[PDB]
Amino acid sequence: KSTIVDFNPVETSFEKWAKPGQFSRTLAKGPKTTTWIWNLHADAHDFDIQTNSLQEVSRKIFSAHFGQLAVIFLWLSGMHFHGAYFSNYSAWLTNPTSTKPSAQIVWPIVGQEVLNADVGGNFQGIQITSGFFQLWRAEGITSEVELYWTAVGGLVASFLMLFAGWFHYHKAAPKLEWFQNVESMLNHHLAGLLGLGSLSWAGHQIHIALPINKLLDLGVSPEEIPLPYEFILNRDLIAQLYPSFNKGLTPFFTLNWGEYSDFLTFKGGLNPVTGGLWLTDTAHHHLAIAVLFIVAGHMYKTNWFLGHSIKTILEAHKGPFTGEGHKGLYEVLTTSWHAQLAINLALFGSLSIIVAHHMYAMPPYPYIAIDYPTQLSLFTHHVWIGGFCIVGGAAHGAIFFVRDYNAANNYNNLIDRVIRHRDAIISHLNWVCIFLGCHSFGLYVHNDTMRALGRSQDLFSDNAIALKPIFAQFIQNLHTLAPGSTAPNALTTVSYAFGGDVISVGSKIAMMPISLGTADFLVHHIHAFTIHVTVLILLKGVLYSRNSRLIPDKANLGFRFPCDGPGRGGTCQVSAWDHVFLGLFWMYNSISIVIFHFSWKMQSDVWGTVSPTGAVSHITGGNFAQSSITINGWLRDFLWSQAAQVVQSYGSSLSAYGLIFLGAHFIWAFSLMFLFSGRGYWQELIESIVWAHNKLKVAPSIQPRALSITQGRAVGVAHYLLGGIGTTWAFFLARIISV
Amino acid sequence: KVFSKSVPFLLKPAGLDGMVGDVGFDPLGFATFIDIRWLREAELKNGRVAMLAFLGFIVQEFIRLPGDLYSEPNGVKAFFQVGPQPLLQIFLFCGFLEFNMHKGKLTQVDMFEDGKREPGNFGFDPLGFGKDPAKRERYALAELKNGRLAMIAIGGLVHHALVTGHATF
Amino acid sequence: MKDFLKYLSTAPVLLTAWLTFTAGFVIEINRFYPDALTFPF
Amino acid sequence: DIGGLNPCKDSEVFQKRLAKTVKKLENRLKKYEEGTPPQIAIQQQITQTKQRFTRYADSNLLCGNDGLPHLITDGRWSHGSEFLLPSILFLYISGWIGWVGRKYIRTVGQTSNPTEKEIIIDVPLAISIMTSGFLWPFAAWQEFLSGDLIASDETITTSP
Amino acid sequence: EKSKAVPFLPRPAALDGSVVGDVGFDPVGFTSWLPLSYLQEAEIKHCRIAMLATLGWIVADFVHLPGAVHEVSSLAAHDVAVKSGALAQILIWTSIAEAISVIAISQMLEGSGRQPGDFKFDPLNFAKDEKSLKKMQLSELKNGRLAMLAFSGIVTQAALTGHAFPYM
Amino acid sequence: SHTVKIYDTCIGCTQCVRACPTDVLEMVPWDGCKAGQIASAPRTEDCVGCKRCETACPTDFLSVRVYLGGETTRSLGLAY
Ligand code: CLA
Ligand code: CLA
Ligand code: CLA
Ligand code: CLA
Ligand SMILES: CC(/C=C/C=C(C)/C=C/[C@@]12O[C@]1(C)C[C@@H](O)CC2(C)C)=C\C=C\C=C(C)\C=C\C=C(C)\C=C\[C@@]12O[C@]1(C)C[C@@H](O)CC2(C)C
Ligand SMILES: CC(/C=C/C=C(C)/C=C/[C@@]12O[C@]1(C)C[C@@H](O)CC2(C)C)=C\C=C\C=C(C)\C=C\C=C(C)\C=C\[C@@]12O[C@]1(C)C[C@@H](O)CC2(C)C
Ligand SMILES: CC1=C(C/C=C(\C)CCC[C@H](C)CCC[C@H](C)CCCC(C)C)C(=O)c2ccccc2C1=O
Ligand code: SF4
């Protein structure tokens, strides 16, 4: 009878497994039409409509989190197992600059063995662009046995998380008060999870990754490198590489932290041997992060007369312009899972995009900057994940507004005041979007039409009307001057992208000053415009989710509904879901432009080879500066030019990329059937098909119905995203692996 | 609880009661989700085919027919040397037999739909063995046991020919 | 094991098992007799 | 011969294709070492390529001017193994599938809960029906004769 | 209260007295969330398997079957037997026995009355009444636990030091 | 303004009237059904055409039918 958990709440039985739709009150009666099948999967994780108790929803969410973490652990275990058994990691360790990472071999069936490429190191397989080899090398993993043991540990951890989810749904489910301890949860997630994870990783780096990687960079082969445990039992194997361990932990406890400058450095730049960040800098960074997060975890009052109450902090932040201020926000975020999901997903996607930027900007792994496929894939993948997560955060903000928003509890607070002037916000955001689009894109079109008319001096180019990004160049200058002036204890700039020397590893450029000209001005304003339009769609969905001048009772129709009818001139897509659908489209557009800008700019003005005398030759040859300013330039010198490797991949080991290119084109075009058409035509065609089936006595008892309007839109957008992202995926991968 | 006589640590399977080979052997409960009459018909036919095929092995390796085609002591290699023409005639003759012996109703859903069909009872008894009902049950049990033994032995002989290649001897 | 067998009798599990078996015997036919453009006979 | 094509056994471009593929595979084989699994895999690729080309040559296959086997599907039994025999095989298999599906639909359509037995299949009855589809050509031309294959006027029709 | 084995720990609350080899040893409470019959069946299966395994390991390091394939130590016999297909036959027949076991354990858990580990295999008697059966069940459990620990030690020592039957 | 017609298949279940967002339909006495009531459309000038009325109709092919016609600031749902 614990005060935090309920014991044996749900019986572990297979009876409900044999009753599909048991969770829903409407679906429990059984299918009558094929719409029931689709409704079954669309409501599976909508725990809000399955129970009327916040406690039950919270417990379901907790167990679902455990299942998700078990799935993630299984995926990581699979990655490590493939590295251990079906990879050339050992060969890549001895030749990182000449062996391509491969960790998946393809069975010899139907002639598909051509996919096993010549990745080097007496190996055949698919080249890997996830950068696991570089990460494992940065971890100090020098043998495939360690990868096998990490895979075994991942399997054990996945089983543990599965057992935890089962235990906390069926044997000991926490109570609502336990879930609502946001102060305790924040304290623990900030100190324990974040800070202690940073501290543990700093310890691992210092004791395992720092010596092993230093020996690897010195040229010591992985076979004669001591086993990682020997660096702990023997204080002399690590004190030779870093002659500060001879003093032990006495400098730490005597506040003489200057003695540890051997392995806790602040250098900046990149390791000249590997092209990645100095691992001493990384260990010092993780140590500082650990201390900062542990300190930050002692902020909120949990169980003693010590710390802050988030309710008292929010309620004190009022103002003349904001009425009641943040009063009621604590109740909103402690009684609505959707609001927490909105905030967490938005910040999580933004964090993913920031991670993507800082990855290539400052390569943190050895021999990852010179693996161009890995860098391109990591950036594009993380930016895509960030965009999807941001759209999801907007969607769940809209869901909270529709479902969990209480008008009485939010009288004259920030949420109320935002809804009260939603018109002004949306109208000014509309004006900003029109201004930004007009300018950015019409400058592009003006360049295109001036070039087409033979007026080269009328373009918005560097040798013409020039739009120099002076503000960004000022920041670039400030960073390259930071070491010794504003960061006096730095030896080198944080990233060579801001300026400095060309860093090359094995005649391949790792990082180099990224010059910003009029071409970068236009593409940056294109980014701003696309982001603003996506924000416009999502914010219009969130703010007008409850009511509008069209439908004053839109909240009574729910978050997900197709329309209110053909009246009022037509009330299609007025939902808030139909705004997360359009916003998904615009996020695809924005992220596609972002990754295109990254790919072309890097290939044209960063990546390449360096001659022995210091001459820099890039992959494309600097065509970004003069040919990325017109739409015809993007079509020809980027799309047409770099699509050559994809279309000429047939018969080679990259033929799978051409096949996926074609299939993604097919899927993207397939989406337009659902996006352009309507439900009535398909229902009436199914009518004649059903007539034929009845004529042959083969009409199913479950009456076949065309997909609902909302499901038709969902299928269309899912296929559109899959096709477009897969086309860009195949194009990028084939292009950057070939060259 | 009764518990099976064959598998003594398992409960007695259902649906086998009035049969001529009941020793309570059905751990997987195949008689619960498959018609017992169809199962006995299939067991009897498989057994009879296996008995004929085992006798065919032993005779083929010994006697054989005159001709270049019929000159392989190994049954597995004889299946290939004989060619498709003699085998397809056997296939068509067996099909004709199947059609005429079951009188049209050949499938799992069609056979035993009207009942009045003892499993495995084609009425084939020209030599008259089986007029006395006292020995009829013993003959049925002997046929079942010989059929099962011949299924095991037919598999054994076929796989011996595959792993060695010469003959059975 | 009365409701577990009923769960295995659901449409998704049965379709997954049948399609896995189908792809399996197709792939194995194409392994043992590869590159079959015409009928073997 | 038929349509101006020539047998692949006498098509020079066919042998040129075989030689070029084998040469590419051998050049790939040259860059690996000893009896290592990559060399074994490439050698198996070469052997399979040679076997496939030899089988296509000795298969009554007509090759065009590009040295690729062309299919003669006008209906002649001479090239009957290209389309006609696979056509019969597919017709048998697909008729089997359709027949067992229709039989299952009509069988569980006369029970108390027909819709339940469509998401939760009656595996015993399903297995019973599925193995009975080998007689689908005979069953179809025994149910059409009895009028049990086609509905007449209980089928629904739209307003016009 | 105050289980017999660990006198300072409470009784596991699922093992009162009515099981052979029940000294109340369950400190981590495995019986609190798993069926007792299931755990008993697993323990008895482990006991029998490890008894056979210990005897086989010790004997095969002394006596070898005729043939060159059977001329390896028990430590290296796994990779040789799997290649020759010797372990494939054992796998096939063990899988058959274990499918019948799936049926048996399911029936035992859903009623029936079959005691855990009771396959009724008893050609000789060796157990005529309840008392003899209980004593022999206790002997089987104790010998099986001892053999499980013994096989564990044998394998660990042989892997550590590639020695013959004395694995010291 | 749109046109709304009521047909004698009306069962007087009132679901159309309580679904109209602009108070177009009302229940009036009748003798053609058990409930003794039939829907009426006396305020079609306020009809917006959202067709919520016939989404709540349980009769087989509807008893209230909305025919979209000429547009008005009331029928277009214009707050401006
Ligand atoms: C220092 C203590 C601590 C630590 C380390 C964590 C760590 C975590 N919590 Mg958590 N939590 C804590 C205290 C702590 N919590 C307290 C005091 C409360 C009550 C207010 C909660 C309430 C809470 C909820 C409601 C949820 C989490 C979730 C999570 C996970 C976030 C997912 C993630 O980042 O993946 C990082 C993953 C890893 C690093 C993998 C290794 C982590 C393992 C599992 C250690 C977990 C520590 C655990 C608390 C120890 C208890 C053991 C048990 C025998 C008592 C993460 C594993 C979320 C989640 O995913 O649910 C499962 C979630 O929904 N926590
Ligand atoms: C942490 C992440 C997270 C979480 C927990 C949720 C959770 C939820 N969301 Mg949500 N969402 C997210 C991210 C997340 N979402 C993101 C990133 C987006 C932007 C795309 C959305 C957009 C969104 C909408 C628009 C809606 C939800 C809804 C819901 C609720 C019901 C979900 C459900 O039943 O789906 C069950 C799961 C499915 C139906 C799976 C569908 C399969 C997907 C679409 C295809 C995946 C393809 C995959 C990549 C493989 C393709 C490869 C190909 C080759 C085969 C639930 C509370 C719905 C709701 O009513 O909320 C109350 C709703 O209307 N969400
Ligand atoms: C190439 C196709 C295309 C184009 C041009 C646009 C253009 C636009 N969309 Mg978009 N959209 C598209 C495809 C496209 N969309 C698709 C496929 C979808 C489906 C998901 C959407 C969904 C969508 C939504 C949901 C929203 C937009 C919005 C916008 C507008 C953003 C404001 C802006 O930049 O206006 C400026 C106009 C342009 C940049 C177009 C070119 C104008 C030129 C360059 C300058 C002026 C030329 C001059 C006047 C010509 C005069 C001569 C002539 C008379 C002969 C803009 C009109 C948002 C909106 O309403 O605006 C705020 C919005 O909310 N779109
Ligand atoms: C866990 C049980 C087990 C397992 C997995 C093995 C496995 C192995 N033994 Mg072994 N063995 C066992 C028990 C076991 N033994 C016992 C109990 C004895 C004592 C009689 C022996 C005596 C023995 C000898 C003398 C030799 C092996 C050898 C070998 C290796 C290859 C040949 C072979 O399978 O043995 C063949 C096994 C036998 C000839 C005797 C087995 C007698 C069985 C175990 C007792 C009856 C149990 C019953 C049949 C259970 C029915 C199972 C049920 C599912 C139907 C192989 C690694 C050979 C080798 O290569 O040595 C390195 C070898 O020369 N074993
Ligand atoms: C004998 C047998 C079963 C016999 C049972 C008999 C007779 C008794 C039956 C009856 O009493 C019952 C039960 C009940 C009665 O009402 C009926 C009768 C009839 C009275 C099964 C054999 C079963 C035999 C089996 C399973 C053999 C498997 C062999 C394998 C797998 C060999 C593999 C290899 O050869 C390869 C493939 C390649 C090599 O290089 C490597 C290896 C590994 C050696
Ligand atoms: C495995 C097997 C039987 C296994 C039996 C087992 C395990 C029995 C175990 C038990 O009994 C015991 C031990 C004790 C009992 O108390 C309990 C049980 C449990 C009941 C039979 C295989 C039986 C296998 C059989 C019958 C295979 C026959 C194959 C034929 C005819 C092949 C013909 C071809 O191969 C050629 C010739 C040329 C090819 O190219 C074309 C074709 C046509 C494919
Ligand atoms: C075609 C179409 C239908 C009909 C589509 C239906 C009935 C979907 C049928 C799906 C089948 C029955 C199952 C899926 C079969 C696929 C082969 C499985 C997917 C492939 C896997 C690899 C995922 C609509 O209902 C519809 C509604 C609104 C707007 C546009 C449309 C629309 O375009
Ligand atoms: S059906 Fe399509 S068009 Fe007709 S109302 Fe609903 S959404 Fe608007």
Side-chain angles (χ1 to χ4, degrees), chain A residues 127-149:
Chain A
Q127 192 173 334
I128 290 313
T129 69
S130 60
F132 264 111
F133 282 28
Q134 292 87 345
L135 162 68
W136 294 334
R137 192 194 218 272
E139 291 169 359
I141 287 176
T142 49
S143 173
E144 280 148 20
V145 191
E146 292 152 354
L147 295 178
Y148 168 82
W149 282 118

Side-chain angles (χ1 to χ4, degrees), chain C residues 6 9-11 14 18 33-39, chain D residues 52 55-56 59 81-82 85 89 119-121 123 130:
Chain C
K6 196 174 180 234
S9 301
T10 50
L14 277 189
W18 195 244
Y33 187 47
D35 315 318
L37 187 54
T38 70
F39 208 76
Chain D
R52 150 171 82 254
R55 198 205 304 132
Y56 289 174
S59 192
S81 50
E82 294 159 11
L85 295 185
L89 185 48
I119 62 170
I120 304 180
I121 309 299
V123 184
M130 286 186 27

Side-chain angles (χ1 to χ4, degrees), chain A residues 250-329:
Chain A
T250 301
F252 177 79
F253 292 107
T254 51
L255 296 191
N256 281 297
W257 293 353
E259 301 298 320
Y260 293 143
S261 62
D262 293 11
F263 62 93
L264 298 176
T265 60
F266 182 76
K267 290 182 180 175
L270 304 172
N271 199 312
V273 185
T274 65
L277 296 175
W278 288 98
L279 293 178
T280 63
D281 283 359
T282 308
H284 190 188
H285 151 81
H286 288 129
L287 187 157
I289 292 309
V291 170
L292 181 74
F293 271 130
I294 290 165
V295 163
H298 308 76
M299 200 198 153
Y300 307 108
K301 166 184 190 312
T302 72
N303 267 357
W304 298 260
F305 204 114
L306 179 67
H308 278 172
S309 174
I310 305 180
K311 203 181 161 295
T312 61
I313 298 179
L314 289 169
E315 285 179 354
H317 287 59
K318 308 177 291 290
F321 305 89
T322 42
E324 289 297 332
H326 308 69
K327 196 185 87 180
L329 288 189

Side-chain angles (χ1 to χ4, degrees), chain E residues 49 52-53 55-56 59-60 63-65 70 72 77 81 86-87 90 93-94 97:
Chain E
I49 287 172
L52 285 189
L55 186 55
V59 161
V63 183
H64 289 297
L65 279 195
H70 309 126
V72 293
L87 285 181
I90 308 166
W93 292 99
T94 305

Side-chain angles (χ1 to χ4, degrees), chain D residues 1-8 10-33 35-160:
Chain D
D1 291 331
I2 296 100
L5 312 173
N6 302 125
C8 306
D10 291 331
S11 186
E12 293 179 354
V13 287
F14 197 66
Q15 284 104 39
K16 298 291 180 68
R17 280 189 178 280
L18 167 59
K20 291 177 70 68
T21 47
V22 167
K23 184 178 184 293
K24 293 182 183 293
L25 281 173
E26 293 179 353
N27 271 271
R28 184 176 177 87
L29 178 83
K30 185 183 287 185
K31 70 161 51 57
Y32 293 99
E33 43 185 18
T36 49
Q39 281 214 6
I40 290 175
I42 297 177
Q43 192 59 44
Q44 181 65 230
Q45 262 191 290
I46 298 173
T47 299
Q48 270 210 6
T49 307
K50 277 157 165 191
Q51 286 170 3
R52 150 171 82 254
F53 269 89
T54 308
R55 198 205 304 132
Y56 289 174
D58 291 331
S59 192
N60 189 359
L61 272 183
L62 295 203
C63 275
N65 305 108
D66 63 358
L68 303 175
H70 286 198
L71 299 194
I72 298 296
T73 77
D74 51 352
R76 57 184 79 225
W77 287 10
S78 173
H79 304 271
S81 50
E82 294 159 11
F83 187 69
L84 277 75
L85 295 185
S87 301
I88 292 154
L89 185 48
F90 178 83
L91 284 186
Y92 187 65
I93 298 178
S94 62
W96 192 320
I97 300 171
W99 198 250
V100 302
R102 179 187 180 273
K103 181 69 176 177
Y104 185 85
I105 284 305
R106 297 227 297 141
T107 307
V108 306
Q110 316 152 354
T111 195
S112 296
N113 209 348
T115 63
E116 183 178 1
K117 292 195 170 301
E118 286 200 14
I119 62 170
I120 304 180
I121 309 299
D122 190 15
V123 184
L125 176 66
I127 285 171
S128 295
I129 285 157
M130 286 186 27
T131 77
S132 59
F134 76 104
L135 277 193
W136 87 259
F138 182 76
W141 202 265
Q142 273 309 122
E143 183 178 1
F144 168 70
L145 296 183
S146 63
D148 204 46
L149 188 87
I150 313 287
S152 307
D153 63 358
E154 293 83 3
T155 315
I156 186 179
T157 307
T158 68
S159 185

Side-chain angles (χ1 to χ4, degrees), chain F residues 25-38:
Chain F
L25 310 165
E26 76 184 356
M27 291 312 269
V28 307
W30 199 36
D31 51 346
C33 55
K34 277 73 69 177
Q37 54 194 348
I38 192 172

Side-chain angles (χ1 to χ4, degrees), chain E residues 63-105:
Chain E
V63 183
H64 289 297
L65 279 195
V69 292
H70 309 126
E71 294 293 328
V72 293
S73 69
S74 300
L75 187 80
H78 187 83
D79 279 350
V80 179
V82 71
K83 186 180 289 293
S84 82
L87 285 181
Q89 309 277 140
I90 308 166
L91 193 69
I92 289 155
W93 292 99
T94 305
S95 307
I96 293 176
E98 281 294 327
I100 307 309
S101 281
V102 166
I103 307 301
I105 310 155

Side-chain angles (χ1 to χ4, degrees), chain A residues 549-551 553-554 557 564-569 571, chain F residues 2 21 48-52 68 71 75-77 79:
Chain A
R549 288 177 219 255
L550 270 189
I551 302 108
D553 52 357
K554 201 191 297 189
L557 312 175
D564 197 22
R568 278 79 67 96
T571 48
Chain F
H2 309 306
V48 289
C50 78
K51 290 178 175 281
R52 283 178 195 185
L68 305 192
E71 307 280 329
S75 74
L76 276 161

